[PDB]
């Protein structure tokens, strides 16, 4: 019975709950890894001795909380919990394949941990640049396990993307067209499209790297006619679409949070939002060489790519302006999800604008692989998508479980998390502008002070995550169920009750005849 | 028929608060303490 | 989302020992590893 | 002549960032001079400056490896 | 033309006689010249790792008469 | 308008057109069959026939 | 009772079993490459062969033996097959674009010539032209089989699908023959690496297509495909046309142009 | 040659069989087509069939709209979409 | 062979799809899960001996 | 060459990177303007008392919303391409210097005439001369002249390094099989510091690059008296 529910699952709600559990586990794993990385940069020293194990820790941090926190939680958990519930579908079109994707995730986690386990260690950064990742600088079985972890995560993401696209397009009520779905459904539409149009290049590149390591080929060995910049091209052709994977359902969650608690029945400029998100999903594929403005490209190529980078910059500004104009004269109620949303808007805005500062190739010549880059993406990822996922989890936790979190404890969590992550990632702007390169276990003395400040800010964020478990324990320490939900008419997911039963939409939705 | 309700759509036991606290703290503490054990094992190995 | 009050109440003292138990359970293996690395370096 | 030469000039053939093809084609057409003045029996030091420019252009490891592959007759370059 | 019969004719006239003709033509072309002189360039016949099957120097579909080894040909 | 209907109609339906089809097919079959059988015969006897060794003795 | 017209699936184990079989396969590759062990890899292979076998036996059981496959479920299946097929189109496009990056600007260790000095590719007129003729004849064969399914004649589409499977097996055995009788290995330069890697995944994909055609043939001999609901052969024809157009791209890019 | 390939009026079994049988009568009881008889009037509501006494009713009540107004509909008197004025009456006689 | 198989597979029994045949389906389910869990345990033991250096 | 509590860029010597500072200050104007704008809107319209939840009009503000960010990005991008097309002009290379990034150290080749190459290691912390720096000292410094356009041709053996000095505004990745050309001009003598800006293994934090640039008479007296 237990095995036939939580191991042999064929409904999206239980599978999504299991993504919440696994993503929370991987979030604490990567949180601990970040505690180590900031833990010996508080005081300048070889606390771990050689920095090979430091690169192992940094690579583990990047991999576990990109592919094992944000993608499972966001894509799998929120899609499987919300996309059938918003569109009215009783389930997904391919539930067994979705379950195979979910159950493929923990072997990928196990092989990543085992990749960290072997004595050579896979200390080669998030990008897997050869022949540092080759069979001479990393001669061992660790990076092969890292490659196979990426295989399993990519196959799980591809199967989930296939199921998401077919359940949005096909599992929809008949007289509802594509332009009546809520914007999170559009977010996972373009998101799953970009997964399925990005991950084959990653899979081909890492299969190519595995064949280069083991089967004696020379795709990335220049001594036999290869070129590492081919791997850089393939990897970032995957990677910036993967970047907008990591940001776009965050945009959908943030749009729903902003239009929910403000009292808006309809977000402002729905067709404009949909156009902006398809514009991002169409322009995400022609921008990737902005990651390679210091490799030696042609100057006309660099000019074209920075021009296309500003062309991908404009629709994000359209989205943030439509957010500030769908706040327009609303009955705002200060739930903590709005606190996460305002933090998202401001801090994602400043991180993206520092990205625009980094976009121009002439300045990116001198500001490459420094902590300015780390500040840009740690803003955008590490608190834009992070505050989007806590906005979604705090908002939909009565829907997910049944009990509510304490508002005072959640606002205190927002305060401690806000102070911690801002103190962690503000001074590394000045560190990167001073010229401190990334992936450094030890630094010169002049980069000390900001480092120390940022490190203790990380400890503040550590205190924040403790309160997280405490307040969710407080829910199960209180068992306080809901009276009702406000604005229940414009959201289908709240309308089957908190929490929904195992079989929702036994008889499906009725559509307007027109 | 399957069992549905608040706390009955979760794999873990809900009805006892203290064993729930113990199991959540050992689960999240094992997740937190795994990379510390990994890095101490590569410190012991080298 | 409007909430019904708690079916099981929670006073201050069990909240205090719960947050204390959580922080000591999170910090005792991490502080066990970080409290001594001279033994792990075989120095 | 051009010489009283100081440092290898900016070639208009390769104005872009990557310049490995510059020393590659330079070593190639150095040997093209060498067998050209070998075949026609002309003076071999008329295009003397080609060795100065490929020692000024690409590093000593690459030219040592290329000359070793000449010495064993195993260079895939067109010579 | 809403008919399988044109595809039946096109299989039995264009497809199968074409593949039979090119099979016979490849049997006319089935003559292979003698092996090239073993010149050991360093950009091929490389071994960045011993192979994972058997000897460690033989490929999966290795044939001893046209495929060389980095030591040389074998007889 | 389908291909077997028009192939019967403008080639096989009339008897004089049938005979013209047979004559033209006979000529092209003679050329192609002679080439194919000659190529098969010279491949089976590679290096044995006189035309394979005719160039040695000019 | 279900009022909608979608598929409700029983709780099945093979998601978990297939995922852990994939774990066994990946760890089997790791330990064969680094520790010389075969037994765990063959265990992973045996597990996922029978996993895929009885998973699709289950899918056959709701399809032709229980009839839960609503036309909207058929639309979902054809959408998923189109998504999967454009996934390997973009996968092979990654392989292709790696080949064009290697080919259009040769490095200084190849002599700057495609093909490099010391490697002699076969001219494409005899054997790869025969491969292209085999796959094109198989394309006309599967189109004939599809239109025989449109009309509903059994013995004609039986003969057509036997011809398709026979030329698919003929394709893979003489591709193994040209693997046997080539002048270079996978370690013989970037040209050998690109050509053998692309043709190896093409051979793997045409093996998958031949096995899928064998499965749908054995299904049709058991009288499964009707005149309208015959999505197994539709997926077979789509995968086979994919293999055909991919082989046309390998014939142009690797064989004819650039060599 | 031969026959052999079966017409799907005989090999249809189960849910496929009743949806084909009902669809070639023109009736769709399994929600495959957009329904008919739009009337927001008081005396003539929108008739929606049911098997229970409760159903989801979505109203795209003005043309080319973003949001569908979702609300539960119960057995009894017909109450409208809560912002526009299109009536909805549930009839629980569709198995 | 199909219509009697249609009549068989509409048992209306509550037995799941993987056990609809009965005894050989039960045998095949047992032998595809037992050796799969054995292979998983063997993989964990394999990684444990791979982790400890020689 | 950093100093404690530095918030801005490393101060200028090359004209290319002081023009980069001018563009950096201009885009800092832009980010300050729009960040203060969104900050004022966020602190403004969350602090209202009135409500308006009607079905408002949509297509009446998009013309400014489309053209104004395009105008801001094109005034961003005009100096971008203006200075981007100025670092690749007609070179007049008085000196050519090659470097090749060895396994966690560097090598430098001055072989335009009278072949000279050396390998630059790192001074350890316990072997430091008093008054020197930590993680930024090299025994064999890289000597360049001033007021001259000089080219760096970079390469490596196996792993991807990156020759980077931020005070001169140079950063190019050292790749095997590919030498890259980077120009440099200096207007002051001195000692200008930089570090590796690409990961290269288990001592990646432990290679600095130091550029001692001097007049030319000391180049004859130095390169004539080094080997
Ligand atoms: C059914 C009746 C009880 C059955 C026995 C339960 C106890 C043992 C067990 O089988 O325990 C079951 C397992 C469940 O694990 C799995 O099923 C594998 C997942 C990978 O419990 C764990 O491993 C630990 C879970 C602890 C609680 C985690 C709370 C996470 C909060 C944050 C997310 C909220 C999402 C809301 C939504
Ligand atoms: C979700 C994650 C995320 C997001 C959204 C972005 C968004 C952007 N990123 Fe970034 N990026 C990363 C994640 C992300 N990036 C990561 C992870 C790396 C490094 C990987 C590694 O470590 O190797 C990276 C690296 C990276 C680099 C490489 C730097 C280097 O390594 O040397 C560059 C430079 O071009 C760049 C640029 C941009 C730009 C121009 C945007 C834009 O999309 C931002 C636009 C956002 C806005 C909020 C626009 C603001 C507009 C307004 C407020 C309206 C007003 C505007 C006008 C009036 C004009 N990114
Ligand atoms: C998902 C992307 C992501 C996220 C969130 C983070 C978050 C953080 N990162 Fe990370 N980082 C990367 C991606 C990310 N990073 C990448 C890709 C690199 C480069 C890798 C390379 O070198 O190639 C990097 C590199 C990197 C370095 C480089 C090391 C060096 O240069 O020497 C450092 C150190 O300062 C760092 C620090 C941090 C810190 C202090 C956080 C903090 O924000 C951590 C705090 C976050 C949380 C606490 C999350 C909240 C979690 C929960 C609440 C539990 C889950 C449960 C529920 C949600 C219910 N990061
Ligand atoms: C010996 C095999 C042929 C026996 C005769 C035969 O079948 O003839 C075909 C047919 C009779 O066979 P049939 O009975 O199939 O008739 C064919 C029917 N029509 C014409 C409507 C298509 O005879 C002819 O067409 C006339 C004989 C001449 C054929 C053409 C000769 C051209 C070359 C001249 C030099
Ligand atoms: C991106 C561009 C895409 C389009 C590109 C379009 C052009 C591509 C190139 C086309 C081929 C060019 C060369 C062809 C001619 C070769 C001539 C030659 O060498 O002849 C002497 C050689 C050797 O002569 P032989 O004497 O040994 O030939 C045997 C002769 N017979 C048959 C009479 C016994 O002959 C050939 O190569 C003949 C080739 C015949 C087969 C051609 C294809 C047949 C149809 C296949 C598909 C069927 C589908 C159904
Ligand atoms: C590697 C393992 C691949 C597993 C796989 O693709 O299984 C077939 C998959 C599952 O079948 P599914 O349609 O989900 O069955 C339940 C509802 N009929 O089938 C599907 O999801 C439909 C076809 C998708 C093809 C994806 C191939 C990978
Ligand atoms: C210190 C941590 C334990 C604090 C225990 C305590 O005093 O609990 C009482 C109170 C319970 O929370 P309460 O105010 O009832 O609920 C907020 C309404 N949403 O707790 C709180 O409100 C938190 C008080 C934290 C004081 C520091
Ligand atoms: C690589 C792995 C993935 C390969 C591609 C898988 C594609 C699957 C597509 C979807 C199949 C499917 O579910 O089709 C629906 C069909 C039921 O519908 P239908 O039979 O038309 O209707 C009843 C008729 N009375 O149901 C079926 O037809 C079910 C059977 C289809 C699956 C057959 C699987 C063949 C697998 C071949 C490759 C095997 C790989 C391992 C061995 C080789 C290794 C090199
Ligand atoms: C929030 C604002 C947008 C984010 C800006 C991030 C980059 C940054 O802060 O750069 C540092 C910037 C320039 O530094 P600068 O003042 O020129 O230092 C030398 C002369 N004092 O200096 C500043 O921005 C001033 C200090 C931070 C103010 C907040
Ligand atoms: C003077 C020319 C100039 O560039 O002025 C700066 C600004 C208008 O220039 P513009 O580039 O359009 O805007 C700044 C972009 N961040 O123009 C200004 O900032 C206006 C300066 C004069 C008015 C100052 C009023 C201050 C009131 C307090
Ligand atoms: Cu050299 Cu990092
Ligand atoms: Cu990018
Ligand atoms: Mg770099
Ligand atoms: Na440190
Ligand atoms: Zn309405």
PDB file of N, CA, C and O in Angstrom, chain E residues 20-29, chain F residues 27-45 49 51:
ATOM      1  N   UNK E  20      18.493  -3.553 -56.277  1.00  0.00           N
ATOM      2  CA  UNK E  20      19.159  -4.703 -56.884  1.00  0.00           C
ATOM      3  C   UNK E  20      20.267  -4.265 -57.836  1.00  0.00           C
ATOM      4  O   UNK E  20      21.357  -4.856 -57.848  1.00  0.00           O
ATOM      5  N   UNK E  21      20.006  -3.215 -58.624  1.00  0.00           N
ATOM      6  CA  UNK E  21      21.000  -2.692 -59.555  1.00  0.00           C
ATOM      7  C   UNK E  21      22.203  -2.116 -58.824  1.00  0.00           C
ATOM      8  O   UNK E  21      23.347  -2.368 -59.217  1.00  0.00           O
ATOM      9  N   UNK E  22      21.974  -1.367 -57.742  1.00  0.00           N
ATOM     10  CA  UNK E  22      23.117  -0.830 -57.014  1.00  0.00           C
ATOM     11  C   UNK E  22      23.835  -1.901 -56.199  1.00  0.00           C
ATOM     12  O   UNK E  22      25.041  -1.766 -55.971  1.00  0.00           O
ATOM     13  N   UNK E  23      23.143  -2.974 -55.796  1.00  0.00           N
ATOM     14  CA  UNK E  23      23.821  -4.100 -55.154  1.00  0.00           C
ATOM     15  C   UNK E  23      24.767  -4.798 -56.123  1.00  0.00           C
ATOM     16  O   UNK E  23      25.929  -5.073 -55.792  1.00  0.00           O
ATOM     17  N   UNK E  24      24.284  -5.071 -57.338  1.00  0.00           N
ATOM     18  CA  UNK E  24      25.129  -5.675 -58.365  1.00  0.00           C
ATOM     19  C   UNK E  24      26.263  -4.743 -58.779  1.00  0.00           C
ATOM     20  O   UNK E  24      27.377  -5.203 -59.062  1.00  0.00           O
ATOM     21  N   UNK E  25      26.000  -3.434 -58.784  1.00  0.00           N
ATOM     22  CA  UNK E  25      27.006  -2.457 -59.178  1.00  0.00           C
ATOM     23  C   UNK E  25      28.089  -2.376 -58.101  1.00  0.00           C
ATOM     24  O   UNK E  25      29.280  -2.269 -58.416  1.00  0.00           O
ATOM     25  N   UNK E  26      27.697  -2.457 -56.827  1.00  0.00           N
ATOM     26  CA  UNK E  26      28.681  -2.502 -55.751  1.00  0.00           C
ATOM     27  C   UNK E  26      29.463  -3.808 -55.763  1.00  0.00           C
ATOM     28  O   UNK E  26      30.626  -3.833 -55.346  1.00  0.00           O
ATOM     29  N   UNK E  27      28.846  -4.898 -56.230  1.00  0.00           N
ATOM     30  CA  UNK E  27      29.613  -6.124 -56.428  1.00  0.00           C
ATOM     31  C   UNK E  27      30.616  -5.979 -57.570  1.00  0.00           C
ATOM     32  O   UNK E  27      31.696  -6.575 -57.515  1.00  0.00           O
ATOM     33  N   UNK E  28      30.290  -5.192 -58.602  1.00  0.00           N
ATOM     34  CA  UNK E  28      31.307  -4.809 -59.583  1.00  0.00           C
ATOM     35  C   UNK E  28      32.394  -3.945 -58.955  1.00  0.00           C
ATOM     36  O   UNK E  28      33.571  -4.061 -59.314  1.00  0.00           O
ATOM     37  N   UNK E  29      32.025  -3.073 -58.019  1.00  0.00           N
ATOM     38  CA  UNK E  29      33.008  -2.212 -57.374  1.00  0.00           C
ATOM     39  C   UNK E  29      33.726  -2.875 -56.208  1.00  0.00           C
ATOM     40  O   UNK E  29      34.548  -2.217 -55.560  1.00  0.00           O
TER      41      UNK E  29
ATOM     42  N   UNK F  27      14.934  -1.822 -77.889  1.00  0.00           N
ATOM     43  CA  UNK F  27      16.203  -1.155 -78.191  1.00  0.00           C
ATOM     44  C   UNK F  27      16.951  -0.752 -76.917  1.00  0.00           C
ATOM     45  O   UNK F  27      18.153  -1.042 -76.759  1.00  0.00           O
ATOM     46  N   UNK F  28      16.239  -0.121 -75.977  1.00  0.00           N
ATOM     47  CA  UNK F  28      16.880   0.299 -74.734  1.00  0.00           C
ATOM     48  C   UNK F  28      17.277  -0.891 -73.866  1.00  0.00           C
ATOM     49  O   UNK F  28      18.310  -0.842 -73.182  1.00  0.00           O
ATOM     50  N   UNK F  29      16.497  -1.976 -73.913  1.00  0.00           N
ATOM     51  CA  UNK F  29      16.835  -3.185 -73.179  1.00  0.00           C
ATOM     52  C   UNK F  29      18.068  -3.839 -73.776  1.00  0.00           C
ATOM     53  O   UNK F  29      18.879  -4.395 -73.033  1.00  0.00           O
ATOM     54  N   UNK F  30      18.216  -3.800 -75.106  1.00  0.00           N
ATOM     55  CA  UNK F  30      19.418  -4.337 -75.740  1.00  0.00           C
ATOM     56  C   UNK F  30      20.659  -3.615 -75.259  1.00  0.00           C
ATOM     57  O   UNK F  30      21.640  -4.253 -74.858  1.00  0.00           O
ATOM     58  N   UNK F  31      20.605  -2.281 -75.233  1.00  0.00           N
ATOM     59  CA  UNK F  31      21.773  -1.512 -74.807  1.00  0.00           C
ATOM     60  C   UNK F  31      22.103  -1.740 -73.332  1.00  0.00           C
ATOM     61  O   UNK F  31      23.253  -2.054 -72.985  1.00  0.00           O
ATOM     62  N   UNK F  32      21.095  -1.644 -72.457  1.00  0.00           N
ATOM     63  CA  UNK F  32      21.342  -1.787 -71.024  1.00  0.00           C
ATOM     64  C   UNK F  32      21.731  -3.214 -70.650  1.00  0.00           C
ATOM     65  O   UNK F  32      22.621  -3.418 -69.817  1.00  0.00           O
ATOM     66  N   UNK F  33      21.093  -4.211 -71.267  1.00  0.00           N
ATOM     67  CA  UNK F  33      21.394  -5.603 -70.967  1.00  0.00           C
ATOM     68  C   UNK F  33      22.772  -5.999 -71.478  1.00  0.00           C
ATOM     69  O   UNK F  33      23.482  -6.767 -70.814  1.00  0.00           O
ATOM     70  N   UNK F  34      23.168  -5.484 -72.650  1.00  0.00           N
ATOM     71  CA  UNK F  34      24.513  -5.734 -73.151  1.00  0.00           C
ATOM     72  C   UNK F  34      25.566  -5.131 -72.235  1.00  0.00           C
ATOM     73  O   UNK F  34      26.560  -5.796 -71.914  1.00  0.00           O
ATOM     74  N   UNK F  35      25.341  -3.891 -71.766  1.00  0.00           N
ATOM     75  CA  UNK F  35      26.277  -3.279 -70.821  1.00  0.00           C
ATOM     76  C   UNK F  35      26.364  -4.054 -69.513  1.00  0.00           C
ATOM     77  O   UNK F  35      27.467  -4.295 -69.004  1.00  0.00           O
ATOM     78  N   UNK F  36      25.216  -4.462 -68.965  1.00  0.00           N
ATOM     79  CA  UNK F  36      25.217  -5.161 -67.691  1.00  0.00           C
ATOM     80  C   UNK F  36      25.881  -6.522 -67.756  1.00  0.00           C
ATOM     81  O   UNK F  36      26.695  -6.865 -66.893  1.00  0.00           O
ATOM     82  N   UNK F  37      25.577  -7.296 -68.800  1.00  0.00           N
ATOM     83  CA  UNK F  37      26.169  -8.621 -68.923  1.00  0.00           C
ATOM     84  C   UNK F  37      27.654  -8.544 -69.254  1.00  0.00           C
ATOM     85  O   UNK F  37      28.441  -9.366 -68.766  1.00  0.00           O
ATOM     86  N   UNK F  38      28.066  -7.550 -70.054  1.00  0.00           N
ATOM     87  CA  UNK F  38      29.489  -7.366 -70.324  1.00  0.00           C
ATOM     88  C   UNK F  38      30.251  -6.969 -69.066  1.00  0.00           C
ATOM     89  O   UNK F  38      31.365  -7.453 -68.838  1.00  0.00           O
ATOM     90  N   UNK F  39      29.660  -6.102 -68.232  1.00  0.00           N
ATOM     91  CA  UNK F  39      30.309  -5.697 -66.989  1.00  0.00           C
ATOM     92  C   UNK F  39      30.413  -6.855 -66.004  1.00  0.00           C
ATOM     93  O   UNK F  39      31.438  -7.008 -65.327  1.00  0.00           O
ATOM     94  N   UNK F  40      29.368  -7.687 -65.922  1.00  0.00           N
ATOM     95  CA  UNK F  40      29.408  -8.862 -65.053  1.00  0.00           C
ATOM     96  C   UNK F  40      30.478  -9.839 -65.524  1.00  0.00           C
ATOM     97  O   UNK F  40      31.268 -10.354 -64.718  1.00  0.00           O
ATOM     98  N   UNK F  41      30.555 -10.064 -66.841  1.00  0.00           N
ATOM     99  CA  UNK F  41      31.538 -10.995 -67.386  1.00  0.00           C
ATOM    100  C   UNK F  41      32.965 -10.496 -67.193  1.00  0.00           C
ATOM    101  O   UNK F  41      33.862 -11.292 -66.895  1.00  0.00           O
ATOM    102  N   UNK F  42      33.207  -9.193 -67.357  1.00  0.00           N
ATOM    103  CA  UNK F  42      34.564  -8.712 -67.130  1.00  0.00           C
ATOM    104  C   UNK F  42      34.909  -8.627 -65.650  1.00  0.00           C
ATOM    105  O   UNK F  42      36.095  -8.655 -65.309  1.00  0.00           O
ATOM    106  N   UNK F  43      33.915  -8.523 -64.761  1.00  0.00           N
ATOM    107  CA  UNK F  43      34.247  -8.547 -63.341  1.00  0.00           C
ATOM    108  C   UNK F  43      34.570  -9.954 -62.858  1.00  0.00           C
ATOM    109  O   UNK F  43      35.473 -10.129 -62.032  1.00  0.00           O
ATOM    110  N   UNK F  44      33.834 -10.961 -63.346  1.00  0.00           N
ATOM    111  CA  UNK F  44      34.099 -12.349 -62.958  1.00  0.00           C
ATOM    112  C   UNK F  44      35.472 -12.791 -63.452  1.00  0.00           C
ATOM    113  O   UNK F  44      36.180 -13.544 -62.771  1.00  0.00           O
ATOM    114  N   UNK F  45      35.914 -12.250 -64.582  1.00  0.00           N
ATOM    115  CA  UNK F  45      37.191 -12.617 -65.173  1.00  0.00           C
ATOM    116  C   UNK F  45      38.168 -11.452 -65.101  1.00  0.00           C
ATOM    117  O   UNK F  45      38.794 -11.099 -66.104  1.00  0.00           O
ATOM    118  N   UNK F  49      40.903 -11.574 -69.133  1.00  0.00           N
ATOM    119  CA  UNK F  49      40.578 -11.344 -70.531  1.00  0.00           C
ATOM    120  C   UNK F  49      41.691 -10.559 -71.219  1.00  0.00           C
ATOM    121  O   UNK F  49      42.595 -10.016 -70.580  1.00  0.00           O
ATOM    122  N   UNK F  51      41.528  -7.767 -73.014  1.00  0.00           N
ATOM    123  CA  UNK F  51      41.450  -6.320 -72.849  1.00  0.00           C
ATOM    124  C   UNK F  51      42.013  -5.848 -71.515  1.00  0.00           C
ATOM    125  O   UNK F  51      42.361  -4.671 -71.387  1.00  0.00           O
TER     126      UNK F  51
END
